């Protein structure tokens, strides 16, 4: 194979710039209006708009009302630029990442970790609002994780809580989503870490409900929902208090916080490896609100 090719190459003239050719089939011949075959009319036909190069626009049918105008207007793409979108994160792919080690299950898992492990691709400029944890491959998913997403299905939540873990649905504004997806470019702007905005009024009920594992829901109502899901799907809810990873599973960030262990208003240097914290009363009040 390769050794045989190298042996053949050894007994051949030195490779230089005078014996190089492109890969066959990669260079189509260029056609020019010269000669008998491609001259004369030069592939333009006879007298008319087509040969004279002045023909009606695309979609014009010659005077008849065009097909793209005669169809009545209906609302299909109305408000498309304002619809929120969520990339799907399947449990099959999550287990694939965990097994390959791209996403470690021993630490809280969120959008930053998924992007660092190249598991999801989030485009805030394309009306993306995060990742929805879909239920694909829930039967074969077996991994204790503390997964944080933006949307979650009942089956996916049931699978996570059956395997043992904490699934929480959190909200990010477009700016916070961009920052959390690509923190390194943000720290090069010399800007203090902003506050995570509250969900819009249309999304408040979703994130203030315990059945959706919302991050603004009452903590005391979670056990009821977990037990209801366990009863519905025929598994026993595992008490995570006895687990040694209880602190890691219960490690939840503040709703006004973007990054674990970092507070709004702090400025990261990334050159002196230092974090600067303001002490002004007004700035502290603004950032802790």
């Amino acid at each position: 194979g390769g050794a045989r090719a190298l042996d053949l190459l050894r007994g051949l003239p030195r490779v230089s710039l005078a014996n190089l050719k492109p890969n066959p089939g990669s260079k189509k011949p260029e056609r020019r209006p010269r000669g008998r075959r491609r001259g004369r009319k030069c592939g333009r036909g006879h007298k008319g708009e087509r040969q004279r190069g002045t023909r009606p626009r695309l979609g014009f049918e010659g005077g008849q009302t065009p097909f793209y105008i005669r169809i009545p207007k209906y609302g299909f793409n109305e408000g498309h630029s304002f619809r929120r979108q969520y990339k799907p994160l399947s449990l099959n792919r999550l287990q694939y990442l965990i097994d390959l080690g791209r996403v470690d299950p021993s630490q809280p898992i969120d959008l930053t970790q998924l992007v660092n492990g190249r598991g999801v691709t989030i485009q805030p400029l394309k009306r993306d609002y995060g990742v929805q944890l879909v239920e694909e491959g829930a039967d074969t998913f077996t991994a204790k994780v503390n997964i944080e997403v933006q949307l979650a299905s009942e089956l996916a939540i049931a699978a996570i809580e059956k395997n043992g873990g904490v699934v929480t649905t959190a909200f990010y504004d477009p700016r916070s989503l961009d920052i959390v997806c690509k923190p390194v470019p943000f720290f090069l702007r010399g800007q203090p870490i902003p506050k995570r905005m509250l969900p819009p009024e249309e999304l408040v009920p979703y994130y203030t409900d315990a059945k959706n594992r919302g991050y603004l829901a009452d903590p005391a109502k979670f056990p009821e929902a977990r037990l209801e899901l366990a009863r519905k799907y025929g598994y026993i809810l595992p008490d995570i208090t006895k687990d040694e990873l209880f602190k890691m599973l219960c490690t939840r960030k503040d709703p006004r916080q973007i990054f674990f262990g970092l507070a709004p208003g702090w400025v990261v240097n990334m050159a002196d490896k230092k974090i600067l914290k303001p002490t002004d009363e007004n700035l502290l009040k603004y950032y802790t609100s």
Binding site: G2, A5, L6, L9, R10, L12, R14, V15, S16, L17, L20, K21, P22, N23, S26, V115, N116, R118, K182, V184, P185, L188, M270
Partner: protein
């Protein structure tokens, strides 16, 4: 007196074995076989891709080309606003301007419209594989020579020319050093007075220069640098942002 033995730092694939090359010295005419060096098969023994070499060479030739040729059209040629003669009754051909391409001194219908840029970029993996293939071809055809260092006993270029003739290095020799600042003054002076003997740093290594020069000369630090740089591509992730921005394990 002790042999210079060099091993591969990066993990060689289990199904392949490193290739081997002689390590020589430039301090004497007969100072050959000063040691043995092992070279990574994926860099110095990959498959020969002459098509990829051609692609990389053409990219190097054409990506930085800017064509300044420009001609004037009938709208830019001086004059020609008025109609030369009435449409009918003259008995001659009908014309609208004297700067038409049919007229002497008129505009050009489809002439060059410079400045024009032929800029395009091949993928980074392809551009690295081109260097891999060039190094492998040089090693296979025995145009590649590994040196412990580029230091010469004297700065006289005739000494280097006679040494190349004695060792049968062909007409053209391209010496590569690890860093530009740390190049020995003897070899710098020897190369500065020569035309077919060109000294470049490891950063400046390219397929065009390697093909133009019959013989390539590398140092052990240069070999290690090239192996690291070329094998980083085979295991790097897909980029989230430009690699000039900080990463956890980059650079090194």
């Amino acid at each position: 007196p002790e042999p210079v033995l060099r091993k591969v730092e990066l993990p060689v694939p289990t199904h392949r074995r490193p290739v081997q090359a002689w390590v020589e010295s430039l301090r004497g005419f007969e100072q050959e076989r000063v040691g043995l060096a092992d070279l990574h098969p994926d860099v110095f023994a990959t498959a020969p891709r002459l098509d990829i070499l051609h692609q990389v060479a053409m990219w190097q030739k054409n990506f930085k080309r800017i064509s300044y040729a420009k001609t004037k059209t009938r709208a830019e040629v001086r004059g020609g606003g008025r109609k030369p003669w009435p449409q009918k009754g003259t008995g001659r051909a009908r014309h609208g301007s004297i700067r038409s391409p049919l007229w002497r001194g008129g505009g050009v219908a489809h002439g060059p419209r410079g400045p024009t840029s032929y800029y395009y970029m091949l993928p980074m993996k392809v551009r690295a594989l081109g260097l891999k293939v060039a190094l492998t071809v040089k090693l296979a055809q025995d145009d590649l020579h590994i040196m412990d260092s580029l230091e010469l006993p004297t700065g006289d270029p005739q000494y280097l020319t006679e040494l190349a003739h004695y060792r049968r290095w062909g007409d053209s020799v391209l010496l590569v050093d690890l860093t530009h600042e740390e190049m020995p003054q003897s070899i710098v002076e020897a190369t500065s007075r020569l035309k077919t003997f060109n000294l470049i740093p490891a950063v400046g290594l390219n397929v065009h220069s390697m093909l133009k020069h019959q013989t390539l000369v590398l140092t052990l630090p240069t070999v290690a640098f090239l192996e690291d740089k070329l094998l980083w591509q085979d295991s790097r992730y897909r980029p989230l942002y430009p690699f000039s921005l900080p990463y956890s394990d980059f650079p090194r």
